[PDB]
Amino acid sequence: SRLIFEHQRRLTPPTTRKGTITIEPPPQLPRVVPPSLLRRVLP
């Protein structure tokens, strides 16, 4: 009545590298001193 099936192996789609991607925190608002025209008027 019906045909027969054989347990051929399942194929593997590339799975996930289920790791822990880590990200470095940004810099820390470096303090900038006033421009100071006296030492800024040379040109």
């Binding site: 820390q28 608002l29 303090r31 900038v32």
Partner: protein, 81 residues
């Protein structure tokens, strides 16, 4: 060393923790705006934004230098009279 105090800011958890409404552009904000608009404006003319060497600002500051030397010579010969 000199024991510096890196800028810090916690929370409030009270009544005076949402009352200020003071709009005043700090120096950092205007620097940041300048930089962002000079990294976008260098992303539609150079088509790369690693920002290692910016020639656009170079051009603009060159024309500005022309203008400044212009006005300098103008007055330095206005003193001639």
């Amino acid at each position: 060393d000199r024991r510096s105090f890196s800028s810090r800011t916690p929370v409030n958890e009270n009544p005076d923790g949402v009352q200020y409404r003071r709009g005043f552009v700090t120096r950092h904000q205007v620097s940041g705006w300048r930089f962002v608009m000079r990294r976008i404006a260098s992303g539609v003319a150079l088509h790369d934004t690693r920002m290692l060497v910016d020639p656009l600002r170079t051009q603009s500051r060159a024309v500005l230098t022309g203008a400044l030397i212009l006005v300098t010579g103008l007055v330095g010969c206005f003193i001639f009279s």
